[PDB]
Amino acid sequence: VNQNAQALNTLVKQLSSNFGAISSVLNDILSRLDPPEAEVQIDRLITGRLQSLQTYVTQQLIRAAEIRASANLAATKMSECVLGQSKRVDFCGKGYHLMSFPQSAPHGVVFLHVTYVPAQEKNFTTAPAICHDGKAHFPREGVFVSNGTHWFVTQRNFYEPQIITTDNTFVSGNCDVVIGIVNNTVYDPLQPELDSF
Amino acid sequence: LQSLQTYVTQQLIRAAEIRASANLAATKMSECVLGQSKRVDFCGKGYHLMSFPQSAPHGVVFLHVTYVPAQEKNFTTAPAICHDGKAHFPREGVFVSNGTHWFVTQRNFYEPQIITTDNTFVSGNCDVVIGIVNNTVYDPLQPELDSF
Amino acid sequence: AYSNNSIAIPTNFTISVTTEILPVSMTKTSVDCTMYICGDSTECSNLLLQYGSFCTQLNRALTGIAVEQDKNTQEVFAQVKQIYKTPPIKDFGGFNFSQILPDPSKPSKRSFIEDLLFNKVTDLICAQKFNGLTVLPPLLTDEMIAQYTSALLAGTITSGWTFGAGAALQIPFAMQMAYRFNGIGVTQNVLYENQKLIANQFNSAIGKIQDSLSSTASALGKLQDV
Amino acid sequence: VAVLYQGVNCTEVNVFQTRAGCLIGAEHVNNSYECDIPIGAGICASYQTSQSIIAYTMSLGVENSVAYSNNSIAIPTNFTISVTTEILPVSMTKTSVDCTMYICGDSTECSNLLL
């Protein structure tokens, strides 16, 4: 709003500048000097006021390029952040994006974004794989964690400790390849069900 | 004054061009460096992994670590496996064969895996699928129940 | 080839590192209107003041350029307000980052790659200030922009994708590539079994990028054009 | 008020010299804080403590060394839902200017010279 007010204000104030003539008002010049000597002063006044109008049109087209870059960016945030869900980081704002609430504002728009940021952290012990019968086990979703006693499986985004099972891991490779593999016991849920049967 | 006005107008046009390049660099700064972008040919050729910024005069230099596959081999495929009369569709990956036994593997790398109940899923039947092939789906509980 | 029953799956891969050169800001210059006409004379001031506010609008315009040029570097160079440091004991799982990491033994903090980037682009600032074009220095000096880069590198090596979206969470880089392969559709089996081969692929790729920047000086021509 | 000169050392002239130029009326403090009013070449100023304007080196933020180890991992046990604010422009004032009335109105001779 300040660039339009300052642009219109300069655009009006240039009429008060004389631009090399006797006076800025055309009635004092046309009411005194004769028309043939006066036409030279009129051509200097038109050319000066003309240069101010072409200067104004060039600044408006240049400012039109920034308002169009911001408008296309607003349409991009409007598309990704509001209607759907954008997985881009630091696009819809800091944190993992969820939803955006648009709000009307004079000569623009304000976006209220709902983000997910973690708060409390705790140091854990990790291993890339679990060695049980001699063949390796890798996590299907998440990473391996331990509190110093038993190895747990949990997601990277939040802590939900789970017992190592066959559905939480997948069998690939062996124990002599992966660097950092640890030995533990993989729980098989079929065993107590068959013992009870 | 007219020569100076030409200079300032040309500088304003370069200010809009340098703003389009700086905001594009800031966007690539957020998506390529901090996180991981799955967009194709944004962070550079190949599947993007990581981007490393470096200070440079009046700009920035990005080192993009990408995943480009190299060697491949032609294999025989099929959309589904018909076993007991109902179609077995791949959960993750595709069905491949070397001409002897049908294998299950992902599209991004070749890692042979036998057909089990957990790598596929049962949906529909066998007549409605175009290109389905016949094979024997291995049941993991059959030898365990026989040994028990 | 095109067949209904034919498929191709890659049995091997390679890690390529490229370079894209994007200019950020240019040198900020502001030229005074009265001295550009002439100095030490009232004839330039009386006839130039007779044209009104042209100096003021062109001066406020060049000042507006210099402020936005500091703001573009502020939205790009510094993403986070927290400084991250590189630990002295380095075990990355077989990767050698000493080329891309800054060298503390140098008087000014810069990496081995930024040492070549500063040398391949051609005081001149005071020389331009002698003819009446004033070059205002940037708010962020070369050591701090390089410190922003070293902070962002140290965060990617240690914290990974966490510090961009929140507090920095420590993760080992050997497990970090497992998530980066799982995001692109590559099983982490490729990482854990071929990690020794990937270490030689990455170290050779960094050596080839360093050789391309040292042998070919026209790769920085995007900034040389500016 | 702290008066700053641009691209010149101290000539005429709490008179200090920085890379941006001669800075008078401000005090130089070796410690570094969060910036408020920026200047250039890594020096800014703020009003702090009987109070005056102090000049100081750009602080890049809190320096924190994150521990890194092979078997060490940190997973978040709690989360926070934050709302941020993004302001972007959309539209600007629509303006249309007419050549005759803007340059010369109520003038027949000047209106014929414009046509």
Per the CB < 8 A criterion, the answer to whether C134 and D7 are in contact is yes
Give the number of beta-carbon pairs within 8 Å between B and C: 237
CA-nearest of B28, A23, C134, A17 to D6 is: C134
Residues of chain B in contact with residue A194, where contact means CB-CB under 8 angstroms, are 148
Q: Which residues of C101-137 are buried (b: 16+ CB within 10 A; e: fewer)?
A: bbeeeeeebbbebbebbeebeeeeeeeebeeeebbbb
End-to-end CA distance of chain D: 54
Residues of chain A in contact with residue B16, where contact means CB-CB under 8 angstroms, are 62, 65-66, 69
CA distance B62 to C23: 12
* DSSP percent split of chain A into helix, strand, coil, nearest 5: 35, 25, 40
CA-nearest of C92, B148, B38, C132 to A197 is: B148
Point out which residues pair with B133 in neighbouring strands: B81
Look up residue C37 and give its two tokens.
């006409």
CA-nearest of C136, C80, C106 to D41 is: C136
Per the CB < 8 A criterion, the answer to whether C210 and B82 are in contact is no
Mark out the alpha helices in chain B (DSSP H runs): 2-28, 141-147
CA-nearest of A21, D19, A121, B93 to C186 is: B93
Per the CB < 8 A criterion, the answer to whether B21 and C22 are in contact is yes
The conformation of residue A162, written as its DSSP 8-state character, comes to: B
CA distance B105 to B109: 8
Per the CB < 8 A criterion, the answer to whether A143 and D73 are in contact is yes
Per the CB < 8 A criterion, the answer to whether A166 and A133 are in contact is no
Compute the C-alpha angle B100/B104/B108, nearest 5°: 120
* 3-state SS assignment for residue D68: coil
Spell out the residues 6+ positions from residue D81 whose beta carbon is closer than 8 angstroms to its own.
Answer: A114, A115, A116, A117
| Beta strand spans in B23-144 (E) | 47-56, 59-69, 72-78, 81-82, 87-90, 94-97, 102-105, 120-122, 133-134
Q: Which amino acid is at C28?
A: K
CA distance C57 to B140: 81
Spell out the residues 6+ positions from residue D52 whose beta carbon is closer than 8 angstroms to its own.
Answer: D26, D27
Give the number of beta-carbon pairs within 8 Å between A and C: 72
CA distance C206 to C173: 17
Cβ atoms within 10 Å, residue D26: 24
HEC profile of chain C: CCCCCEEEEECCEECCEEEEEEECCCCCEECCHHHHHCCCCHHHHHHHHCCCCHHHHHHHHHHHHHHHHHHHHHHHCCCCCEEECCCCCCCCCCCCCCCCCECCCCCCCCEHHHHHHHHCCCCHHHHHHHCCCEECCCCCCHHHHHHHHHHHHHHHHHCCCHHHHCCCCCCCHHHHHHHHHHHCCCCCHHHHHHHHHHHHHHHHHHHHHHHHHHHCCCCCHHHHHC
Mark out the alpha helices in chain D (DSSP H runs): 99-103, 108-114
CA distance B80 to C147: 55
| φ and ψ of D52, to 5 deg | -155, -175
CA C110 to chain centre: 12
CA distance B71 to B19: 42
CA-nearest of D108, C100, A46 to B53 is: C100
Q: Which amino acid is at A15?
A: L
Distances (CA, A) of D70 to A179, C89, C118, C174, D73: 10, 11, 35, 8, 8
The conformation of residue D112, written as its DSSP 8-state character, comes to: H
Spell out the residues 6+ positions from residue C189 whose beta carbon is closer than 8 angstroms to its own.
Answer: A138, A172, A173, B111
* CB half-sphere exposure, C56, CA atoms < 13 A: 10
- The secondary element (H helix, E strand) that includes residue A6 is helix A2-13
CA distance B96 to B77: 5
Compute the C-alpha angle D66/D71/D74, nearest 5°: 50
Q: What is the resolution of this structure in A?
A: 2.8
Residue with tokens 């604010």: D85
**Pseudo-torsion of CA C114, C116, C120, C126, nearest 10°?**
50
Look up residue C25 and give its two tokens.
């800001």
CA distance C66 to D100: 37
What is the total residue count of chain B?
A: 148
CA-nearest of A74, B19, B62, D46 to C70 is: B19
Residues of chain B in contact with residue C23, where contact means CB-CB under 8 angstroms, are 18, 21-22, 25, 58-59
The conformation of residue B113, written as its DSSP 8-state character, comes to: B
Q: Which amino acid is at C89?
A: I
Residue of C nearest to D41 (CA): C139
CA distance C188 to A158: 21
**Pseudo-torsion of CA C135, C137, C142, C147, nearest 10°?**
-150
Residue with tokens 């001779």: D109
The chain B residues in contact with chain A (CB within 8 A) are 2, 5, 9, 12-13, 15-16, 19-20, 23, 27, 30-31, 34-35, 37-38, 111, 144, 148
Give the torsion sign (CA, D47, D48, D52, D55).
negative
Q: Which amino acid is at C100?
A: I
CA distance A51 to C50: 15
- For residue D3, with 0-12 CB atoms within 10 Å meaning exposed, 13-18 middle and 19 or more buried, which class applies? exposed
Spell out the residues 6+ positions from residue C42 whose beta carbon is closer than 8 angstroms to its own.
Answer: none
CA distance B90 to D48: 67
- Do C and B count as touching (3 or more CB pairs closer than 8 A)? yes
Q: DSSP letter string over B19-49?
A: HHHHHHHHHHIIIIIIS----TTSSSSSEEE
Q: Between C57, C178, C193, which is nearest A10 by CB?
A: C57
| Chain C nearest CA to A196, separation (Å) | 37
* Biggest alpha carbon–alpha carbon distance for chain A: 122
